[PDB]
Structures are given as structure tokens and as C-alpha cells.
């Protein structure tokens, strides 16, 4: 049946930025769908909660310390995963950051800091995952967390560096899809709207200004992303590669 297309039994999934928000919910979802899940975060202490919730559904998570901006750590992450799980079938390149700062006042260091995690971290993770998948010869699926910020410019908060980085992620996704298609490795991006998670908690002062801009009238919940990440990680999405998928309560329409 159509339902069995969503089964992840026998699959090995890596999720970066897995300690909170979207990554956390997605890790739990994948375990619920039968996957062996490796969870990565800048500080492995932060992975306790997700690893416990994963145990809670009868799986065992593999926690991995990784700063996705650092090639040596990304290398160590994939080696830890292939070493302990035997390989990798699914990679969610999800670690991301934001700050608020007028473009005219923005130090280069701050511009670059957002590029390094948001674009370079995705590139390093996806490349490492893709290399492992090519070697296996079994195809695979890679998902990147972009943002509606890769399509539109958020207002009133000034986040030009964030917008730049997420447009980069959207198009890097397609570039990798084209190159990896001969290997039957699919690459797609998810572009969430405003989701009530830790990423946006510091921007609570803006929430009430964002809500009237969202046709569905509310910020999303991170649990509302699991169905889509499951879709992309599973056989249900076998014909989809190089796609971006907006999930934003209608925000990008007006």
C-alpha cells in the first residue's frame, strides 16, 4: 500500500542540528518510522533529550559531536556513523543559525559566521554523506533545511545575511541533485516559514508582527515538519530530486 512507501525500517539516517527544534522532531519521527538514527550537534550533551525520546519509542540513537563548519569533525561524524551503523542511507543537513543586524552596520565577521554554518556546514555534511553513499552503490536521499528566507526577504527584522545563506542552500541543493542523480542519490530542500522553535525564541518580540503576515494566522510547530521530512527520506519521494518545498502557512504567496 501507499503507507508502506513511508517505512524507514533498515535505513540509517544522519541528522545534524538534532538537539532542538526541527532536527529533534525529525530524528524522533525517523526512529518512529523504523530508522537507525545518528544525531549530531555542536555539543553532544545537548543530545540527551532527543536520545531519550528515541529510546522512548524503542530505538537507540547514535549521538555525535560535530561542528558542521569543521571538515575534521564532519569527517569524524561520517566515520563514526559508517563505523557503528555500517553506512548511511539518509542525511538531513539541518544545522542552521541566525542573528538580527542592519546590513549597513553588519561586520564582515557576522555576515561570514552565518554563511559558514548555514551554507558551508550544509556543503560539508552533504558532500561527506554523498561520498559515503557513492561508495555504497545503493543510492540514497539527502535533505537540506533551507527557509522561506531563501525566497523572500523577512521584515521588519534585518536578516540579509540569513536570506543570502538560505538562497545559497536552496540552489546548492539543486546543484548536488544534478551531480548525484547518476548515483541515484536524491537531493531536496525544505523551506520552512516561521516555526516556533529555539532558532526563533530570541526573536519573540517579532512573533506578534509576523502572525498577521501568515495566511494561516499562526506560526508553525516543529511537529508539522515531520511528515515532509519523512516523505523526502522514504521511498514515497522516489521520483523527486532537485526540488525545493515551501512549508510556510502561505507566507510567500502575497
Amino acid at each position: 500500500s501507499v503507507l508502506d512507501l513511508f517505512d524507514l525500517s533498515g535505513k540509517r539516517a544522519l541528522i545534524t542540528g538534532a538537539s532542538t527544534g526541527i532536527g529533534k522532531k525529525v530524528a524522533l519521527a525517523y526512529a518512529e518510522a523504523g530508522a537507525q538514527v545518528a544525531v549530531a550537534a555542536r555539543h553532544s550533551d545537548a543530545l540527551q533529550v532527543v536520545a531519550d525520546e528515541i529510546a522512548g519509542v524503542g530505538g537507540k540513537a547514535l549521538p555525535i559531536r560535530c561542528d558542521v563548519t569543521q571538515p575534521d569533525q564532519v569527517r569524524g561524524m561520517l566515520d563514526q556513523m559508517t563505523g557503528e551503523l555500517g553506512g548511511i542511507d539518509i542525511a538531513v543537513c539541518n544545522a542552521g543559525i541566525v542573528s538580527v543586524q542592519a546590513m549597513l552596520d553588519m561586520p564582515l565577521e557576522e555576515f561570514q559566521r552565518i554563511q559558514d554554518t548555514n551554507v558551508t556546514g550544509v556543503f560539508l555534511t552533504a558532500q561527506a554523506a554523498a561520498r559515503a553513499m557513492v561508495d555504497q552503490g545503493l543510492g540514497g536521499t539527502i535533505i537540506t533545511t533551507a527557509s522561506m528566507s531563501g525566497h523572500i526577504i523577512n521584515i521588519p527584522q534585518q536578516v540579509s545575511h540569513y536570506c543570502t545563506s538560505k538562497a545559497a542552500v536552496v540552489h546548492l541543493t539543486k546543484a548536488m541533485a544534478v551531480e548525484l542523480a547518476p548515483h541515484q542519490i536524491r537531493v531536496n530542500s525544505v523551506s520552512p516559514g516561521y516555526i516556533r522553535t529555539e532558532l526563533v525564541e530570541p526573536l519573540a518580540d517579532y512573533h506578534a508582527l509576523w502572525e498577521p503576515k501568515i495566511p494561516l494566522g499562526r506560526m508553525g510547530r516543529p511537529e508539522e515538519l515531520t511528515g515532509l521530512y519523512l516523505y523526502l527520506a522514504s521511498a514515497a519521494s522516489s521520483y523527486m530530486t532537485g526540488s525545493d518545498i515551501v512549508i510556510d502557512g502561505g507566507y510567500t504567496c502575497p
Copy 2:
């Protein structure tokens, strides 16, 4: 409560136009496998026997409805039948579409108009009728349109300028409806398939995954859009094309 439960359509009532063949037929069957009661519509009622039998085969009973989606009175009648027989509507898939090949330079107006009428106007009438019934129910709902990668790129070598025009129109109509229906919690989204084996040797080299897709490769996505799994998504277009639109 787990992610897989978000995809359950038990107790939901779905309408699919153009349900007799291809994508519509696979989606009808998938919705029945997921627990939905399914109304299947086509211009020729006898053509609906195959899908109705397949739905019987997974233990559903389909409601076959004859409808020309270009005709406002027949569309109204389709919704009346479905509301009357099933009690209402939670999901509509506005899928009926047509195509022909003709150089723009030589294209008669009748032919240009014929493709707009089914592909754009039929989607408009169907979504409108479904949205009206959903508004009256007060329970929200989900509407899905079948557009095409032809709404984003121009197919070659075949000349289908009218089809491409009609599919971009559907993509944007979908967004226009999503915006107006959001206050009613009725979500509206489009699917844009690439080449689906419902010329072949010329198309394949252009597709990064190296093959046309199978209509069964659309069922996961149409199920995603019809179910609670997609609760935060509205006004989105989703391309599913083997990578065709990337280069």
C-alpha cells in the same frame, strides 16, 4: 500518536476529478488504501469502472460521478452528489487535464481555448465548488491541484505552448485560492509532475534520474497533501520531475 498517523485518511471524504486513468486513478486507490471514502469523477462514467473495481479490491466502495469539469452546472451536481451520498467533502483533487501538440504559430484559437477551458477553468470550477461546500461545513479542508513542470519550464521539442500557459495559470490560481481560503483553514496546494509514463527517447536524456516516473510515484505526495501531515502547508507548488527543471 506517531508521524505515520498523520497520513491516515480514515473518516475523510475525498473527491478526485480525472480519476479514470493515470495519476488520478493511482491517487484514488491510494486514498482508499489510506482509509478515505473516495468519489471518482470523469467525463465518461463507464471509464470509471476500472478504478471503482480496484477500490473495491482494497475494500473501499468508490462513488462514481459523471462530470464535465468545464460545466458549472455539472460541477455543482458533482458536489451535490458527493455531499448527498457521503455527507460532505474534506479533500478535493482537481486533476482532470488535457494536452495536444501544435506549433504556436499555427494554433487555431479553438485549440488554444480548449486546453485553457479544461486545464484552468475546470480546476477553477472544481476548487471553487469544493471550497464553497467546505466553507459551509465549517471544518476546514484540503484542495490539491495537478499542475505540471510545464508551468515552470517550456517543453521541447514538442510544441505545447497552450499547455504550458495553462499549467502556469493553475500554479498561480492555486496560490490565489490558498490566500483567500486560509481564513477558513482550507489549504490549497499544487503538484507539478515531470514526465510520468501514464517522444520518450528524446525526453529520457533530459531527465537527471534517467527515466520517466510511474504514476505510483505520485501517490506518496498526494497523500501527504491530503492528510494532517501537511497541516502547515498552503499556497505551495511541489515539483516532482526526476530533476528535469534543475538544468
Copy 3:
């Protein structure tokens, strides 16, 4: 010099919807640039003002009655132009209409009325112009007036039928560009934002609601479109075909 790329001396231009707003300003601009201009409108009486302003710069306009929804009239328009001017080098498919109406309440007749002028009228005009250009063997340029409504959904006024029609125009433009490229006939669309013209005068109640949504802080003037239509009509745009060009004061960015 770069300036001579914009010269229309010796060129024959047809502009539909030429009695007011954008079409009127564009007709005057093309005459100022040296073109022989045929101006079309549903009622030829309405072309008096534009024909006079064209005389005002030392040209003579060819006024043509044409309902662009009617094949016989479109046929008559091109025949009148080729007959009197010898041919056609530039075609601006500009006639367009709008009404405001909730989608849920919209009669099919009203939906269709907007499609017929906005999409079908463009198709008929562009096809007729393109056929004449193919026969000439000299290449040519075709410009369509789309709208930012082909990219975004206007709020708060309900104009779903208008949005549908302009997305259609945007993509029809590209479809024609692909087919006409072997003939060296370029086809491009202009997608204006809110421009203070006759088209939007009935929607004056909305103006004050639109303005805060436009980053430049104001509606455009029809004179602010002439440079772009000149660009597309002239040799300055020799390498551009199948492009859409948004000119909207920043509206589509947020």
C-alpha cells in the same frame, strides 16, 4: 555608442491598449525614439489623445480599432498595419483588464472575461504579429504586459482571476520565445507593480493600503515604464528572450 542601441528609427511598432496608461506612454516613447507607431484600442475614438501627443513630437500615429479577443479584428489590425506601414518589427501586447471579486462568489463569466482579454488577447496579438514577422524574415521583438500579479497574490483586494491570467501571460511569453527564437524573434514580458493609471483608478480605496507594502513608498507612474519598454523594443535587448522583468518598487521582495 551605447545610446544608439535605443534608436527605433526605421522601425514599425504596434501597441495594443494604447489609449491610456502604460500603452499610451509607451506609444509616445517609441515615436520619440523614431518609430512609426500603430496604436490600437477597443474604441478608436479613445486614441485621439495619444495620436495628438504623437503628432506633438513630429510623428504620425496609425490609429486602429481592435478588440484583441476577436480573431477577425486582430486579423484586420495586422493587415491594416502591414498594408499601411509595410510591416511590423515591434509588437507590444498590452491590452488588459481587472475587476475585484471574492473567488468563492465569482461567476464563471467574470473569471472567463478576465482570461479572454488578458491571456487570449495577448495570444492572438502575439501570434498575428509573430506570423507577420516570420514572413518578413527580418526577426523582431514582441513584448507582453504581464504584472507582479503573475508572481504574487494581491491583498486585500480579491483578484484571483487577474492573478491567474497574468501568470498565464508570463509563461505564454516564454513558450513563444522558445518557438520563435529560430526566427530571431525575441519575446519578453514586463511585470509592473502598482502603477497610477486608469486600470487601477476604480481601486482608489486601496491605494493607501498598498503604499506601505511597497518598499519605495509609492505607486509608480506610467512614465516610469517607458525606459524598460524602449529597452525591450530596441537593439539594446538583442540578447534577451524569454525573460520576465519585474518593475514594482520592491513589492515582490518581502
Copy 4:
């Protein structure tokens, strides 16, 4: 007052980075032909002699400025020189860009970063510095970035994933800046060229117009964006690609 007057750059002061060859060089010359005083910047000052001589040839005097656009202190110095010598800045073209060919799978991080640094970070620093000076002047202004059709599609067969990434970034950075600078009446727009003859036999069949473009075919558009002709346009990307992105 006529449409042609909208394109006059007399009395305007323009900065062009990457001005020593290709698009930047043609645009510099075109801006001088249109009456602008033109500062031309490149990483190697001797490379600017050709353009400076061509500008002399139409009766302009170019201001050559050595600048590595990746370096915030040199960018600041470039703007200081231009303000100091010309009195200010009305037009900035952030044009300097680079490319290499390398499979994503094998791409060293240094190489990925190298292309981002010039193509994205160099555009950011240049536009930022120009915008700061324009804000201080209080007279508005116009900023133009050179992106690429590589920001919309993925080139094949050559593997340039880093370049494609950098050009999508530039397209969106341009919009982000347009939004923030609109209150200052500083417009910001991007140009996305296709294949410009500044592999050939593989690319040509993919281009509907059947040829690569010439850099002189960009001058009209860069003049459009730099002059009063484009007064209502900001946050726009303009593709100029012989039709490449349509199929």
C-alpha cells in the same frame, strides 16, 4: 524631456569592480559614453590600463582603483578614493566574480570557499560600502550586482556547484539589500547573464538564440539600471541569456 534623456548619466559618479575585462570593461566604457565619471577597480592595477585608455578614447578620464573586493579595508579605501577624488558616488556595479570547474564530490573546502568569498562576500562588501556612502550623501543612488543564470539553473556538463551556489546567493542578497535601502531611495538590482563570450560547442545547442552573447549586449541593460530610466525598479533580477532558462 523625452525617454532617451532618462538614460543620460551626465554628472553621475559610477564605480565598477572587476572592470578590467569582459562585462565590467564594456559597462565602464558605456557609462563613460553616457556621460558618467567612472571609477574602475580590479585586483591588479596594471590590468586597468586598457579600459582607462578606452575611456580616454571617448573623452572620459577613468579613475583606476586597485582593490581586492574580499578585503574590508581595501573596499573602504576604494570608496574613500572615489569620494575623495570624484566627490561621491551615485552608481555602484558589484561585478567582480570568479569561477572554476570541479566535481562537487571532490571539491576541496578551500575551493568552495574561494568562490563564495569573491562572488558573495565581495559583492556584500562593495554594495555595503557604496550604500554607506550613498546614505551619508542623502541623494539616493543605484547599486547593480552581476549574478548569473547560474543562480537560477544548474550548468551542465561542467560541474560548477560552488559557482551556482554563489550566484543564487548574490541574487537574493540583492533583494535583501533593496528592501533595507529603499527608505534611502537607493535602488538595488541584479543582472543574470547567460553564456557571454568574454565547452562552447556543447553550450550553443542549448541556447534558443543559437549563440553565446557578446559583452556589448549587456551595456544597454547596465545603462538602464544605472540611469533614471529604471527609477521604479528595485529588488529585481533580470535574466539575459538567449533563452537558456526557458526549457
